[PDB]
Write a protein that binds this ligand. Structure first.
Ligand SMILES: CC(=O)SCCNC(=O)CCNC(=O)[C@H](O)C(C)(C)COP(=O)(O)OP(=O)(O)OC[C@H]1O[C@@H](n2cnc3c(N)ncnc32)[C@H](O)[C@@H]1OP(=O)(O)O
Ligand SMILES: CC(=O)SCCNC(=O)CCNC(=O)[C@H](O)C(C)(C)COP(=O)(O)OP(=O)(O)OC[C@H]1O[C@@H](n2cnc3c(N)ncnc32)[C@H](O)[C@@H]1OP(=O)(O)O
Ligand SMILES: Cc1ncc(C[n+]2csc(CCOP(=O)(O)OP(=O)(O)O)c2C)c(N)n1
Ligand SMILES: Cc1ncc(C[n+]2csc(CCOP(=O)(O)OP(=O)(O)O)c2C)c(N)n1
Ligand SMILES: [Mg+2]
Ligand SMILES: [Mg+2]
Lengths: 872, 699
């Protein structure tokens, strides 16, 4: 069982042509680059039959025209191993010791020389010999990891736990990284991980009490929110403190909640870290919250959200000073082997794309594992980049605890079955070297077992409560009754003046200057448009001292060139953020941060959700370019935004700004899928609104921000109505009007007694209907707007309908197809909420399997048809 | 305007310590590995302010302890440039010519030496000098690309087209690759691409008639399905023939339909290619349908479906002999610059993960572009692996034709605005070298313009039909009235006996043997369970002569250990597929193929959808591990499966097997979201069923 290729008999070669000194230094570069290909990183003597074996002839001396006869000859190695001259024998020994033992490194791909040299020096120096106390501490962690898994197997044989057996070295690895971070003087470590060994991590790393874990297996689950639905045991988060064993350092450890959907936590945990770092506010030299992200090998290679999130690592609005990635490479998925799982040689090969170091470490060598954890954490601190650890291990049992893996992988599990564990191996190693005594070895096992038995007994003696019906989370949070969202005239005037207070040598772009000038004058004269109404909300909130973050694709300028949150001087390319400067001058340390996201909805929205969780006091808005593309981030909407509170008691105030409107731009530039958002809405999960005026949008945003209702807000924003003069708001609507209006009654009714027909509408379609009403002089029609879709303001709608006693019929008018828009929601619910209301008649486009027509001229035809149908 | 670093004044260094021969060969490896970092691949003199500039000191001779005084000294280069000895001056010249001109190569990361040597030899040999006929042909393609874009700008000023202006070299690149494939004797090229320059590709590459394109701008759209809703002009597919200009080769070219959702076509087009290759049935030496996949730089880096699909390249049930990837690197998204778009140095850096060559080529050097296209196609044929071309270009106008990019990128568009086009540059180059004459240059421009004017006039003289209401696709296809789906007793007994007809030295796993024994006896005694009922359906269909493909996570065994489509001998690890063997013995060339998918729903289901489109006669079933995870492939369900027929007239018979049932396994192992599937269902778009008996599922 020698891993290297034997020396080959050959005749000595003359030192002609390429010099042997050249050949030697080529050999050195070969090992530094490709030495990992033959490194002893695999605990099993296993090669996957269908996996292409890479060529590694570059590591043989024959390839470099060197022979056994050169071994004792001296060569100039140019400072290799801190020596100018060396024998080939010594060169080979040093190369093999550094690159072909338990740690396989990929770093030569790194372009920065200082980075490469830093890694090179440390890898070639080797792992320092640990102290006996350190060795004993590693054994304790290994023991705890294995004993915990074995205890659950004994007490709960027929319960799914996703054991860490075969990968117990993860616990000392994580502990090593966290301990190193504590010694660096950092503030917190945020962990995101999958199912694999989650309970083990919760107990041994985070420090969740053992009683809680045992209660979960018994059936008693800890409730997050009052009347919450809950979730399985291996989807929950926790918080704890980590104290340095051999130091005075202390660091906070947090584990984030995640769904069963693999790798969905990646963008969320990054956002949490960023929000935490921003709160600490230690500047560019800070970044004192460490993201520690765990992955499975199949998921890391398979799913695309992984590289998508890594892509955010160095972006201005997303940088967190690097993420430590640990891939638990157990060399299998559920049943799919790596041959059928990926096309890459290594699971961690995405690191090559991003120019980040990779450490492949053998999961049966705990000391090497601990060293790699320390080295990775030091690299992150020094260079502020992502680092990838490939923990090469195996999965002792099936995917779950009630599955037989021998049916499909008989040969692989012939090697796995019957092996001695890493704990056993390490104990034998320590005893062999005389670094540990026998009675100490038995003490470690006995002490920990007694701890678990005692705790188990206390849980058992407690009474087992029977199953009960779960109510719901409808009234778990309070509505802000009596809250006034208007600002003073002085505040409004000051917000307007922000766009006039340009820096000394700053000039607006000629096509932006009119927009800025209008904003300065609108706060007194009027004609405040949608974009200005939105910025007034965010500006006023930032003035009060809040951190307001707006992110999304093309958000700084706006997709429709409406926002201009940050203006750029054409000449100097100097940026100017008027509202941020105003906020900072008010002395409440308010901030208005606007970022252009990367081309991503999944990672984009996920990051903003995470931000809202990491800092509850921040106002975070994610803007889609079009609402149609939000379905790209369906996992985030389904698993986090909509159901986060009910499953985990995790609340968020995330705002989604989704452009919506049927204007004849095709099936993927028309609808934000209102019907899908309303289908997810239950037990008052989130607020869904489609405001018709800038002022109403202003009030909606402020109500959300100033309330204690910690639930998401989904706003369907307009496209063409951004520049519609009829929609503009007066200044009094921001200062005199105190509250958001969920229902706006018809402002053009001369006599309410004459009204025979009432039209319910939501969004831009009102203005078309209003225009037609004025043109035709229809005094018998009243057009009522519904600004808030969910929850349903049935009291306000009833009140509006009651104001027209002679109303015979009620029409629900929408631009969307019949099987889309708010109709399907309102058709089912509204009749129940208002029994006395007449039978609603739908007026809309026909039901379609698509969103909208591709033909623009058809759109005009259907629009005309739609309005004609409304007016008899 | 000299691109290289000036030679530095320095004193001569003694040949002490590391030998200078060593240093020289280190320099050679430096250029082969990292020479691309300083290659003249960018048409613009532009560096993105927020983008981290990589260190490239390894390419300076000073770093290797060499000086100007070594330039004329001779060193042993060990067969570099087919010579044993060389001066440092000559070494530098050859390295710079091969690695720092218009083509930047990344290949040293490739682990296979034969692959690496093959690429090394061709890159260091250099681009062969093209003939005047070849040069003239490149100009014609450049002219067609630019003139087409300019014509649309003139005739339809206020209409969105997503022009290819600034990236016109894409057309000769694609033509080069397709021409090379025709010369290799291959059967078809399947293209998947985004919006950027789609109309240009449809006309100049696929060969869609120009009248059709002009009609679309007028408002007259070609209807796919009777009463279909349709889609915008730059989402449609087409088919055509490509004839070799300088050869007797001929190849079929197809462009697949796609939604506005970027990179969603990637898994679908791969499935189409695989289905086509399987139909041809030329074995492992075949793979004669080329996937040519185009990407934008922001989308290629940003979206995760991209690496997700590339991950399928070498899998048993998904291998198509390699995909040719072209990334149109115009160095911008909508408004987001690469600094705010990616963290990778290059957009094509995913290739490093998969161990595939990358060619960065300057989009203003047409001859280099054409060479790279040929080299990529040859590499695919030889090694059967993915190859990545980074076409470094720019975007002349805004994202669309009605957007001002100067508001947000003033400095970048100070360089872009006012440039001479690649066509203009190449024409001037050809005239300068005397490879082209003046009257020929004017002929190319005039002849093509006259072609477009004539066609435009014929479209204009035709009557413009008014807008009409679109009915629907409910009755566009007929229901099978009177169809009987029962099989004979003899057929049923034979299907049962398939599990008893084990190979000579084959034995079942002890926990599988009871299942096999029950299947043999159930066909007479009874008690046929769900899994057996399902296999009886697929088996009976394969017997008739159909290609039945079942794919999904853990599908061969089954998530719930129910299927056992392929049995494995514990001892020998020998596989046995009873139903496939039976089908092949019936003499109708039927097949029952069962595959374990990778960990992916998006790419997994997308590939099966593609398979159903590429071969209409095949029976394709995708199985989710649990129905709950199907929402991972929401783009495929929304944009392809549910609405494919109504938008493009593209039909599919894909079967989705989604495990469903409330049994107390938690919120992500209970529901397949039946309510969501029923909400998409309209105008009889798809069949949704929940059978209660195995027989009913069979029928
Ligand atoms: C996400 C949520 O808002 S949780 C909602 C809790 N309730 C439910 O989900 C079920 C019961 N729902 C209901 O009774 C209605 O849907 C309600 C709550 C909207 C009340 O209906 P109406 O009285 O017609 O609506 P109206 O717009 O007048 O709202 C009444 C008050 O609630 C406030 N309110 C209503 N919805 C919200 C909301 N989403 N966020 C904040 N405040 C809200 C209003 O600001 C108003 O305050 P006020 O008393 O100072 O005037
Ligand atoms: C996706 C589609 O199937 S497109 C369906 C076309 N129609 C529509 O979309 C509009 C709605 N129309 C209806 O619902 C029609 O009345 C029906 C026929 C589909 C409803 O079926 P019913 O008459 O209630 O029941 P039944 O299941 O007996 O259907 C009658 C026949 O249609 C066939 N059929 C019904 N649905 C399907 C289907 N999805 N695929 C194939 N055949 C079908 C049945 O096999 C049966 O054939 P038979 O005449 O040989 O007995
Ligand atoms: C997106 C998604 N697809 C499928 C599943 C089902 N699933 C859960 S764990 C698992 C295996 C993944 O293997 P790997 O990532 O290697 O992790 P391991 O279980 O080996 O630690 C699968 C398919 C899931 N939860 N999420
Ligand atoms: C998934 C998705 N997100 C967002 C969009 C909106 N969008 C359309 S084109 C575009 C820019 C794409 O940039 P790049 O990939 O570089 O292509 P280019 O337009 O520059 O050719 C964006 C974000 C989309 N169509 N699909
Ligand atoms: Mg795994
Ligand atoms: Mg681009």
């Amino acid at each position: 069982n020698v891993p290297y290729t034997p020396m080959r008999w050959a005749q000595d070669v003359p030192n002609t042509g390429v010099d042997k000194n050249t050949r030697v230094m080529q050999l050195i570069e070969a090992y530094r680059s490709r030495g990992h290909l033959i490194a002893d990183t695999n605990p099993l003597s296993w090669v996957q039959p269908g996996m292409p074996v890479p060529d590694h002839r570059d590591l043989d001396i024959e390839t470099h025209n060197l022979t056994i006869w050169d071994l004792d000859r001296t060569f100039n190695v140019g400072g290799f191993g801190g020596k100018e001259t060396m024998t080939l024998r010594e060169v080979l020994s040093r190369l093999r010791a550094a690159y072909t033992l338990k740690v396989g490194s990929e770093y030569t791909h790194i372009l920065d020389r200082d980075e490469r040299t830093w890694l090179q020096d440390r890898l070639e120096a080797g792992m320092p010999k640990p102290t006996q106390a350190e060795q004993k501490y590693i054994l304790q962690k290994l023991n705890a990891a294995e004993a915990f898994e074995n205890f659950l197997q004994t007490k709960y044989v027929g319960q799914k736990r996703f054991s860490l057996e075969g990968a117990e070295a993860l616990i000392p690895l994580m502990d090593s990284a966290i301990d190193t971070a504590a010694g660096q003087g950092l503030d917190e470590v945020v962990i995101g991980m999958p199912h694999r060994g989650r309970l083990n991590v919760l107990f041994n790393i985070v420090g969740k009490p053992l009683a809680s874990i045992f209660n979960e297996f018994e059936g008693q689950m800890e409730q997050g929110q009052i009347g919450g639905s809950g979730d399985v045991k291996y989807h929950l988060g926790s918080e704890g403190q980590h104290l340095q064993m051999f130091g005075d350092g202390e660091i906070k450890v947090s584990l984030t909640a995640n769904p069963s959907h693999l790798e969905a936590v990646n963008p969320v945990m990054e956002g949490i870290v960023r929000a935490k770092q921003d709160y600490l506010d230690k500047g560019v030299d800070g970044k004192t919250v460490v993201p520690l992200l765990l992955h499975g090998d199949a998921a890391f290679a398979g799913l695309g959200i992984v590289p998508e999130t890594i892509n955010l690592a160095k972006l201005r609005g997303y940088d967190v000073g690097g993420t430590i990635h640990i891939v638990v490479n157990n060399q299998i998925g559920f049943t799919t082997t790596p041959d059928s799982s990926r096309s890459m040689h290594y699971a961690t090969d995405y690191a090559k794309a991003f120019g980040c170091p990779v450490f492949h470490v053998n999961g049966d060598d705990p000391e090497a594992v601990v060293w790699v954890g320390q080295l990775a954490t030091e690299y992150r601190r020094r260079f502020g980049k992502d680092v990838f650890i490939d923990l090469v291990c195996y999965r002792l049992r099936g995917h779950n605890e009630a599955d037989d893996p021998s049916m499909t992988q008989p040969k692989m599990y012939e090697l796995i079955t019957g092996r001695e564990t890493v704990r056993a191996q390490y104990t034998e190693d320590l005893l062999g070297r005389g670094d540990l005594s026998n009675e100490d070895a038995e003490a470690v096992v006995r002490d920990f077992h007694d701890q678990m038995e005692s705790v188990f007994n206390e849980v058992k003696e407690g009474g087992k409560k029977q199953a009960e019906a779960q109510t719901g989370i409808t009234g778990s949070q309070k509505l802000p009754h009596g809250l006034e969202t208007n600002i003073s005239r002085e505040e409004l005037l000051e917000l307007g003046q922000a766009f006039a207070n340009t820096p000394e040598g700053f000039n607006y772009h000629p096509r932006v200057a009119p927009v800025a000038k209008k904003r300065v004058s609108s706060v007194t004269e009027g004609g405040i448009d949608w974009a200005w109404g939105e910025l007034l909300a965010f500006g006023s909130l930032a003035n009060s001292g809040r951190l307001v973050r707006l992110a999304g694709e093309d958000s700084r300028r706006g997709t429709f060139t409406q926002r201009h949150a940050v203006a750029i001087d054409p000449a100097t390319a100097e940026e100017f953020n008027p509202l941020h400067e105003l906020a900072q001058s008010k002395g409440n340390n308010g901030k208005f941060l606007v970022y252009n996201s990367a081309l991503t909805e999944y990672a984009g929205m996920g990051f903003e959700y995470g931000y809202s969780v990491g800092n509850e006091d921040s106002i975070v808005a994610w803007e889609a370019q079009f609402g149609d593309f939000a379905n790209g981030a369906q996992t985030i909407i389904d698993e986090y935004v909509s159901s986060g509170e009910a499953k985990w008691g995790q609340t968020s105030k995330l705002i989604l700004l989704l452009p919506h409107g049927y204007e004849g731009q095709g099936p993927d530039h028309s609808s934000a899928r209102i019907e899908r958002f309303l289908q997810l809405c239950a037990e008052g999960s989130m607020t869904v609104a489609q405001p018709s005026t800038p002022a109403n949008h202003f009030h909606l945003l402020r109500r959300h921000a100033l309330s204690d209702l910690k639930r998401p807000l989904v706003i369907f924003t307009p496209k063409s109505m951004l520049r519609n003069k009829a929609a503009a708001s007066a200044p009094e609507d921001f200062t005199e009007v105190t509250k958001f209006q969920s229902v706006i009654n018809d402002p053009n009714v001369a006599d309410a007694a004459k009204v025979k027909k009432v039209m319910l509408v939501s969004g831009k379609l009102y203005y078309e209907l209003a225009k037609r009403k004025e043109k035709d002089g229809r005094d018998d029609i009243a057009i009522v707007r519904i600004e808030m879709l969910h929850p349903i303001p049935f009291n306000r709608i009833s009140e509006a309908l009651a104001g027209y006693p002679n109303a015979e019929e009620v029409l629900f008018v929408q631009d969307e197809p019949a099987n889309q828009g708010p109709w399907p929601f309102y058709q089912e619910h509204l009749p129940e909420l208002i029994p006395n209301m007449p039978k609603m008649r739908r007026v809309s486009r026909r039901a379609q399997s698509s969103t909208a027509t591709g033909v623009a001229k058809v759109h005009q035809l259907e629009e005309k048809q739609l309005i004609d149908e409304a007016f008899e």
